């Protein structure tokens, strides 16, 4: 081990597992439960500013979260790794990758898989929203939903990342329904096996359509109507008109 949590509860090894542009993920270890864990270091190039406090309280609440469909959050602190002031988070290690990576590999999701996994995402979001205070992901997307295994379940990740900062809900040019729009677009990717708004060339062409509430071409490729019906009720332009997660979970398709 070349580094440790202030708590002494966690150990960093010198073995990189991923390299986002803004972060790095090492393999690490919970001395307490002897389970292998993820040691995420993200440059504070964000200059979080005295909003550091906001994260502290966010991060503290995130430790309080435990649910089958939320990747667990263990710890965070501020260190100076490299020359750069940065932030280290410690979170449950997910080995079997993302929904994004899964789609490519299999290149088509079986409608039975999609139901079970999407339901699970709803269940996760439901947990987050029913917290006090409510937690909004603000950033739900396919590469930060993680699977247990190819035959397994999903867990929403990149929870903390959400604070320190592309298709996002139209109104947003936060609140519970921003995540409903996200989920909708996720389920469309999961249904059409391809990325929403692929047709567009530049970001602005996407922003154009989103603003003027034009749906992605993907939308039409949706085979099953009952799914399409749902995705529809999700990516509705007016905040007010979109379904809630309750509405989606109480849906016939789901439970
Ligand atoms: C073979 C490829 O697989 C990998 O290496 C994975 C890379 C991404 N991983 C992460 C990363 C981050 C920043 C997370 C995070 O940030 C707040 C939160 C989180 O839930 C609370 C889970 C997270 N899980 C785990 C390992």
């Amino acid at each position: 081990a070349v580094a440790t949590s202030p708590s002494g509860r966690f150990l960093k090894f010198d073995i990189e597992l991923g390299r986002g542009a803004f972060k790095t993920v090492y393999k690490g270890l919970d001395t307490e439960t002897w389970v292998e864990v993820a040691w995420c270091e993200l440059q504070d190039r964000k200059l979080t500013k005295a909003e550091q406090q906001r994260f502290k309280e966010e991060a503290e609440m995130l430790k309080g979260l435990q649910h089958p469909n939320i990747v667990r959050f263990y710890d965070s602190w501020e260190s100076i790794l490299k020359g750069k002031k940065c932030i280290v988070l410690v979170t449950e290690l997910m080995t079997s990758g993302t929904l994004k990576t899964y789609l490519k590999r299999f290149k088509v999701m079986k409608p039975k898989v999609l139901r079970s996994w999407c339901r699970q995402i709803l269940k996760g979001l439901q947990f987050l929203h029913t917290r006090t205070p409510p937690i909004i992901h603000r950033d739900l997307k396919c590469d930060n939903i993680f699977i247990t295994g190819p035959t397994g379940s999903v867990k929403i990740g990149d929870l903390g990342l959400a604070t320190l900062m592309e298709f996002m809900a139209p109104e947003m040019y936060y609140d519970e329904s921003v995540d409903v729009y996200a989920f909708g677009m996720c389920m469309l990717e999961m249904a059409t096996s391809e990325y929403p708004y692929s047709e567009c060339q530049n970001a602005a062409q996407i922003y154009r359509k989103v603003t003027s509430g034009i749906k992605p071409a993907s939308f039409n490729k949706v085979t099953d109507p009952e799914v399409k019906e749902i995705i529809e009720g999700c990516i509705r332009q007016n905040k007010s008109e979109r379904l809630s997660i309750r509405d989606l979970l109480n849906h016939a398709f789901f439970a």
Side-chain angles (χ1 to χ4, degrees), residues 42-44 46-90:
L42 348 152
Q43 294 183 240
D44 196 348
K46 149 86 199 178
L47 288 333
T48 139
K49 292 302 90 261
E51 274 87 18
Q52 275 151 5
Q53 196 55 47
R54 271 60 280 288
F55 192 38
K56 293 221 307 187
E57 262 286 3
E58 206 153 11
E60 181 226 36
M61 187 181 194
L62 278 163
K63 293 160 84 174
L65 303 187
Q66 183 166 181
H67 188 272
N69 301 287
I70 318 282
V71 177
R72 183 151 142 111
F73 184 77
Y74 294 129
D75 210 8
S76 150
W77 62 92
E78 307 183 313
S79 88
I80 293 181
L81 264 143
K82 295 140 192 287
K84 316 136 178 179
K85 304 184 72 181
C86 84
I87 289 178
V88 186
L89 333 178
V90 166

Side-chain angles (χ1 to χ4, degrees), residues 14-44 46-104 106-164 166-216:
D14 187 44
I15 50 189
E16 201 216 58
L17 292 196
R19 201 167 50 184
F22 49 120
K23 69 143 90 100
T24 305
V25 173
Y26 298 78
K27 216 177 216 95
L29 222 176
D30 191 8
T31 72
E32 255 203 37
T33 48
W34 304 110
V35 303
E36 211 167 54
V37 145
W39 177 297
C40 319
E41 321 182 324
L42 348 152
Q43 294 183 240
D44 196 348
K46 149 86 199 178
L47 288 333
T48 139
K49 292 302 90 261
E51 274 87 18
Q52 275 151 5
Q53 196 55 47
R54 271 60 280 288
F55 192 38
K56 293 221 307 187
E57 262 286 3
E58 206 153 11
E60 181 226 36
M61 187 181 194
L62 278 163
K63 293 160 84 174
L65 303 187
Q66 183 166 181
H67 188 272
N69 301 287
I70 318 282
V71 177
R72 183 151 142 111
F73 184 77
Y74 294 129
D75 210 8
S76 150
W77 62 92
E78 307 183 313
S79 88
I80 293 181
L81 264 143
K82 295 140 192 287
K84 316 136 178 179
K85 304 184 72 181
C86 84
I87 289 178
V88 186
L89 333 178
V90 166
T91 68
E92 163 168 10
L93 177 87
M94 300 310 312
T95 58
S96 303
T98 68
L99 257 191
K100 167 221 219 74
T101 66
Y102 170 122
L103 255 192
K104 353 227 321 302
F106 279 54
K107 237 338 127 220
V108 100
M109 172 161 327
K110 144 108 257 104
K112 271 170 283 161
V113 166
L114 170 149
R115 174 189 278 85
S116 300
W117 279 2
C118 288
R119 184 196 288 76
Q120 275 172 46
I121 298 166
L122 295 187
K123 278 282 210 146
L125 288 179
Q126 199 202 20
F127 184 80
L128 286 198
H129 292 197
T130 63
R131 291 319 95 235
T132 171
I135 300 180
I136 307 312
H137 198 301
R138 298 161 282 230
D139 190 51
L140 188 59
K141 67 201 326 160
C142 278
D143 38 292
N144 70 15
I145 309 173
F146 299 81
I147 56 170
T148 300
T151 178
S153 54
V154 293
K155 303 180 89 161
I156 313 176
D158 297 37
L159 298 175
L161 261 298
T163 304
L164 25 108
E166 204 269 302
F167 86 49
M168 258 168 202
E171 72 277 19
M172 178 136 69
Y173 301 156
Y174 309 130
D175 88 293
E176 279 81 6
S177 71
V178 130
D179 277 346
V180 163
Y181 183 101
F183 169 80
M185 285 311 233
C186 273
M187 188 188 209
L188 178 78
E189 183 166 16
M190 289 191 255
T192 55
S193 178
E194 54 105 298
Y195 198 82
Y197 285 117
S198 304
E199 336 93 25
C200 313
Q201 229 67 2
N202 44 317
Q205 272 188 195
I206 309 168
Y207 281 68
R208 229 159 94 156
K209 283 208 200 178
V210 166
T211 322
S212 49
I214 311 167
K215 278 149 175 45

Side-chain angles (χ1 to χ4, degrees), residues 201-247:
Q201 229 67 2
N202 44 317
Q205 272 188 195
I206 309 168
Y207 281 68
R208 229 159 94 156
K209 283 208 200 178
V210 166
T211 322
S212 49
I214 311 167
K215 278 149 175 45
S218 335
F219 184 55
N220 311 307
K221 302 201 208 315
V222 177
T223 68
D224 177 1
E226 211 195 11
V227 154
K228 181 150 179 192
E229 165 201 327
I230 284 167
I231 295 182
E232 197 282 303
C234 276
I235 65 176
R236 284 215 208 81
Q237 201 181 353
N238 303 49
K239 276 218 263 73
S240 40
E241 291 201 14
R242 287 180 193 130
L243 312 176
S244 124
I245 313 277
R246 250 211 290 179
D247 308 350

